[PDB]
């Protein structure tokens, strides 16, 4: 049992305009509460370990 084989292909031309509707979101937004610079999307260090107060640990 085989469903219509490949035949025609899609090398160049196409397979180009396919790294843009996704790619990677591109970031570099924030740089930590106070010291140094990590932070993530709303999330404390591991440096000083804090958004503004006591947490995590060096």
């Amino acid at each position: 049992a085989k469903h219509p084989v490949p035949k025609k292909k899609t090398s160049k031309s196409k397979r180009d305009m396919r790294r843009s509707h996704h790619a990677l979101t591109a970031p570099n937004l924030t740089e930590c509460p106070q010291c140094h610079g990590k932070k993530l999307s709303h999330h404390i260090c591991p440096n000083c370990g804090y958004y503004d107060g006591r947490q995590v640990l060096a």
Binding site: H43, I44, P46, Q55
Partner: protein
């Protein structure tokens, strides 16, 4: 589709048989580490049950006893868990991240005190 909240991924018999050999590592230890959802729907259990732990009865020690198969679950809930915070309704241990698994993405906190 549905919504509201409160679901279940891990087994359907894992709702009265899971933290009973998972979150049980909290009576004598407390170094609990289990999902970024479990814990969030685990509060409705830990800090939850305590009103019948304020003192000591018997029925207040049933599915308070046999619900977390152990000893400290009763031999400490009375005079060391409930009273440990018998002044503030809900809200105590600071569950959060810890450093993920490195590979996939699942953090699991720690739970502690003082």
């Amino acid at each position: 589709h549905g919504k509201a909240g409160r679901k279940l991924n891990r087994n359907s018999s894992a709702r009265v048989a899971l933290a009973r050999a998972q979150a049980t590592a909290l009576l004598r230890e407390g170094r609990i580490q289990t999902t970024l959802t479990k814990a969030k729907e685990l509060r409705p259990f830990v800090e939850q049950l305590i009103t019948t732990a304020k003192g000591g009865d018997l029925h207040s020690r049933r599915l308070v006893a046999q619900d977390i198969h152990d000893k400290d679950v009763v031999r400490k809930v009375m005079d060391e868990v409930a009273p440990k915070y018998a002044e503030r309704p809900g809200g105590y241990t600071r569950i959060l991240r810890v450093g993920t698994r490195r590979g996939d993405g699942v953090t699991m906190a720690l739970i502690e005190l003082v």
